[PDB]
Design a protein around this nucleic acid. Structure first.
Lengths: 141, 38, 381, 176, 117, 136
RNA sequence: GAAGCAGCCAUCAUUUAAAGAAAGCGUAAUAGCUCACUGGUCGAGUCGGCCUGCGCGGAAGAUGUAACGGGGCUAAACCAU
């Protein structure tokens, strides 16, 4: 497709699923389409692994095969497969909730290199590390 | 608009330009920043 | 309008499940022909089968008081043929119907299954928005009504128990207490119950506004007596005073208002609460003065010679006598003397003397801060 | 600096008349289009009007870039023409064109009937859009401003006359 | 900023090598989205940032000197912000087709659109 | 504020301000602030000027104060006639000659030390300029 | 109708030419529309301070110009010779 003008966008992993009111006038304008969960997120799972955060994009068009905005599970699969809640840390934190390592945690979701931009390996670890300082999993020098 | 002895400036989109005997403060992004005097 | 209601679950036309839309003009005033056909068509498509030859039932639309015809009510009858002689039970109201009166035509004897008709001659005012049913006998509908009075006593004891356990207190928890009371009578009984709720809605915590003795119909002797007993504003909607209220009012002229619109009433209760509200907040210096060279006097004990270092000094204002962030002594400015004579005011750079009753406590180099206090009058919103 | 020091182009079949210090270009449309000059020296050189500072003045380049922009715009005016659409935001507002007047109803009881100079012409694609084209950028811009003067933009709701390029600059209603 | 005479020396020896070989890229960007290049980048995540990088290198007035005489066919730059790639297996390799299927949304010019032999 | 601990005497002559200041060299600061003009610098002023730049960087760095209020100034009440003995003690003042380094400052970056004196400058009553440490 | 710019936290890095988990308008929120940063284009001067000479603003009053003596002057001023 070729139109991104009006849509509604949500995070829909596990029992966390959905920011609060999609039954309001936000999504009540729209026509209907079943496909796009099964088309967009559901592509990438068996090439990667399980333990992936789940974003979603809700829209409708004539050809019934519309263009995904999010292509992929959100980057920090290495953290989110290992621990916490399926969407992520389940709470924003400076500290407390965990730690990140260089002796055993590298290889857990090694398959997500295939649909992460995060390339050769030493930068790929640091790219999820700042995401983990967001989530709270900070470790001393 | 404001009158003050000092122009002082506000943001980078404030131009700060003279008209006749009178400096003005002209801000593209913000009419709240408007001034004369100087 | 069609597109904007296609953003909601209102059953919109065609794009939704079709609540049908009609396009006609009522503000300007141009028919409306189509709308009349649509209303009939929905009622024909619906199944409206009803008893026309049996017994009568229905609901009360709106109830009011007449002073020659008694308590009355406009009652829509759902089930046909309310007769001339029938016994009626509506909630806690009972009676045999004396007569039935209508605005489409004055004198009604046997009613339809879809029409409002005024009833008159009842024990009290029947509640609006609930059920009237014809009954076998008058004697039994006393006994039911007295059971329903027992039920109103159950609702009385419920409303009596609730107020004490909600916040411990009988009324107000904190010591900064303010309230407003009102006494209210609306002409229509559906209205009195609805707008009284809206006058208890608007309240703040600090000033609490409350109804005491909601009435239906004209102001009477005992209604004026309640606001004479405990201070409240006495208001009535389209309601006005009668002679036995006037007798109390001419004796003690309470706050008496018979009214125009409900918005101005909701504004004037807010205005009353705002006038009720405690008024002051601002404490700001007028002057600062330094003490030197004590004298002794039988007028006040000690006399602290002063030199006002900053600001203005005025005869009566609160003072703070302080040294290094402690208040040494406390007071209200008692005596302002300059040179040899008491004077109304003094300004910085001037020799002064001051002493306060039971002040004997002078230390040189202590400082007096005289300060102005300024009212603000908070307004409820 | 740079463009004040640049010769401006002459595209043939322009008049390119100079008579004392006036410069009079009619060309591919319009009439007249005359400016009068001061302390800017200028040399016609076939395909350009080449500029420089005139005798003894301290305003070299600074008067000249003015003249540079002027004889450019006169050449552009005789060839292309100028400005764009006035759009009517604010519900119920309406534009009625006649050859003399652009009449508007912008919530005013009296009708405006705004009269248009003859070097410019105006058009109504719609009752809400007013489009105009004409000889000179100074005069056409002043006419758009005189139209804009009747109901100015307001950041509460954006009502009145836009050009379709200015900021909305929305400011929230603070009943909150 | 940069003094051109000292700066150009280090660059040209690595940059020129792609042009000399069997095939070289001429990828472009204009009114598309970088997020789709980050799509081709998460494809290049598989190869660890080598083959499918779609490298938006595009300098000509600080770099890409004319000392080799066969490198200026593919190295011209302008509007439509230019991007390089990396080539080694050659002979119409099937690695390209993963880059190819994304062309439905357009993302301007790409390798071998200029009709050279 | 600030004042001498014990009186040599409790009042003083007016005096004069001819000649440039002796103390023109930075002792201890990386930076400081030097007075171009001359004038009277109050004890409220020196209190205020230190307080503002302290607040700005919160607790970063260290400042020295070269200036000191040495002598009193007396002043007359409103009502009194001329003569009848010298005025009473009213305040303490730092009298300065032109070229005097007022403040000095070390443990901050350069621009933040410029800001600190720019902030302090409006509390000061007379024309001043910024200084760097240097050698003899 | 939140995915940088309504909120709260992280106060970092990746992918990378170049792009800070992004500064604003804007969008129902992304996008739109740009900045920061750089490519193409064009073409030489470009950018911020410092010390001094002379101006501008800061500059509102009481019977009538009413603070060059006045007319009046851009030399009939000012500075140096």
């Amino acid at each position: 497709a070729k139109k991104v003008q009006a849509y509604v966008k949500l995070q829909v992993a596990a029992g966390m699923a959905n920011p609060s009111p999609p039954v309001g006038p936000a999504l009540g304008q729209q026509g209907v389409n079943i496909m796009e969960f099964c088309k967009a997120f559901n592509a990438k799972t068996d090439s990667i692994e399980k333990g992936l955060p789940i974003p979603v994009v809700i829209t409708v068009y004539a050809d019934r095969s519309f263009t995904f905005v999010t292509k992929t599970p959100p980057a920090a699969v290495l953290l989110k497969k290992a621990a916490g809640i399926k969407s992520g840390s389940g709470k924003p934190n400076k500290d407390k909730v965990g730690k990140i390592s260089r002796a055993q945690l590298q290889e857990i979701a090694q398959t997500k290199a295939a649909d992460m931009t995060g390339a050769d390996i030493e930068a790929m670890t640091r790219s999820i590390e700042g995401t983990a300082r967001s989530m709270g999993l900070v470790v001393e020098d | 608009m404001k009158v003050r002895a000092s122009v002082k400036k506000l943001c980078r989109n404030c131009k700060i330009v003279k008209r006749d005997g009178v400096i003005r403060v002209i801000c593209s992004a913000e009419p709240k920043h408007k001034q004369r005097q100087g | 309008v069609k597109n904007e209601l296609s953003q909601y679950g209102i059953l919109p036309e065609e794009w939704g499940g079709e609540s049908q839309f009609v396009h006609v003009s009522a503000k300007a005033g141009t028919g409306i022909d189509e709308l009349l056909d649509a209303i009939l068509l929905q009622a024909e498509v619906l199944e409206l089968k009803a008893v026309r030859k049996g017994m009568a039932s229905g609901a009360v639309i709106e109830s009011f008081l007449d002073k020659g015809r008694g308590p009355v009510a406009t009652v829509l009858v759902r089930e046909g043929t309310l007769h001339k002689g029938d016994i009626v039970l509506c909630g806690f109201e009972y009676g045999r119907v004396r007569a039935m009166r209508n605005e489409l035509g004055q004198e009604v004897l046997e009613a339809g299954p879809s029409i409002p008709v005024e009833i008159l001659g009842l024990s009290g005012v029947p509640a609006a928005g609930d059920e009237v049913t014809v009954v076998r006998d008058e004697k039994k509908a006393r006994e039911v009504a007295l059971y329903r009075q027992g039920k109103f006593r159950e609702v009385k004891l419920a409303r009596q128990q609730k107020s004490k356990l909600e916040n411990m207190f009988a009324n107000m928890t904190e010591g900064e207490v303010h309230e407003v009371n009102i006494v209210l009578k609306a002409d229509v009984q559906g209205s009195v119950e609805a707008i009284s709720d809206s006058l208890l809605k608007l309240s703040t915590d600090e000033v609490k506004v409350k109804i005491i003795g909601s009435g239906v119909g004209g102001i009477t002797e005992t209604d004026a007596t309640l606001a004479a007993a405990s201070n409240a504003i006495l208001v009535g909607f389209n309601v006005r005073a009668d002679a036995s209220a006037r007798k109390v009012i001419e004796a003690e002229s309470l706050d008496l208002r018979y009214y125009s619109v409900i918005y101005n009433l909701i504004d004037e209760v807010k205005a009353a609460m705002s006038g009720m509200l405690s008024p002051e907040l601002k404490q700001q210096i007028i002057g600062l003065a330094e003490v030197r060279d004590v004298f002794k006097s039988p007028k006040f004990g000690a006399i602290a010679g002063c030199m006002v270092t900053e600001g203005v000094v005025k005869r009566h204002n609160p003072i703070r006598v302080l040294r290094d962030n402690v208040v040494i002594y406390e007071g209200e400015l008692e005596s302002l003397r300059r040179f040899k004579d008491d004077v109304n005011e003094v300004r910085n750079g001037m020799e002064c003397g001051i002493g306060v009753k039971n002040y004997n406590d002078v230390r040189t180099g202590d400082v007096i801060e005289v300060f102005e206090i300024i009212e603000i009058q908070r307004t409820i919103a | 600096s740079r463009v004040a020091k640049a010769p401006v182009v002459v595209p043939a079949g322009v008049d390119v008349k100079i008579n004392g210090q006036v410069i009079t270009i009619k060309g591919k449309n319009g009439e007249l289009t005359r400016t009068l000059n001061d302390a800017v020296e200028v040399k016609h050189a076939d395909n350009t009007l080449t500029f420089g500072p005139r005798d003894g003045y301290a305003d070299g380049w600074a008067q000249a870039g003015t003249a540079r922009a002027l004889l450019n715009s006169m050449v552009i005016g005789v060839t292309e023409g100028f400005t764009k659409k006035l759009q009517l935001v604010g519900v119920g507002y309406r534009a009625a064109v006649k050859g003399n007047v652009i009449n508007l109803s912008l919530g005013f009881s009296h009708p405006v009937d705004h009269q248009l100079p003859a070097g410019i012409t105006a058009e109504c694609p719609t009752q809400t859009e007013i489009v105009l084209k004409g000889a000179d950028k100074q005069v056409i811009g002043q006419v758009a401003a005189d139209l804009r003067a009747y109901r100015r933009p307001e950041p509460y709701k954006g009502k009145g006359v836009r050009y379709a390029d200015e900021v909305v600059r929305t400011k929230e209603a603070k009943k909150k | 900023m940069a003094l051109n005479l000292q700066d150009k020396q280090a660059i040209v020896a690595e940059v020129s090598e792609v042009a000399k070989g069997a095939l070289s890229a001429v990828v472009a960007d204009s009114r598309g989205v970088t997020v789709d290049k980050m799509t081709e980048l998460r494809k290049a995540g598989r190869e660890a940032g080598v083959y499918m990088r779609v490298v938006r290198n595009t300098l000509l007035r600080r770099a890409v000197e004319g000392t080799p005489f066969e490198c200026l066919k593919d190295a011209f730059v302008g509007p439509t912000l230019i991007a390089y790639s990396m080539e080694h297996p050659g002979a119409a390799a099937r690695l390209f087709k993963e880059f190819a299927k994304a062309n439905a949304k357009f993302e301007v010019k790409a390798a071998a659109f200029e009709g050279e032999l | 504020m600030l004042q001498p601990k014990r009186t040599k005497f409790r009042k003083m002559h007016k005096g004069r301000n001819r000649g440039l200041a002796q103390g023109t060299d930075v002792s201890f600061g990386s930076f400081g602030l030097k007075a171009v003009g001359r004038g009277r610098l109050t004890a409220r002023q020196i209190e205020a000027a230190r307080r503002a730049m302290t607040r700005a960087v919160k607790r970063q760095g260290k400042i020295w104060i070269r200036v000191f209020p040495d002598k009193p100034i007396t002043e007359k009440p409103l009502a009194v006639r001329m003569g009848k003995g010298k005025g009473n003690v009213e305040y303490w003042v730092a009298l300065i000659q032109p070229g005097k380094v007022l403040y000095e400052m070390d443990g901050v970056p350069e621009e933040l030390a410029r800001e600190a004196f720019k902030l302090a400058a409006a509390k000061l009553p007379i024309k001043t300029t910024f200084v760097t440490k240097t050698v003899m």
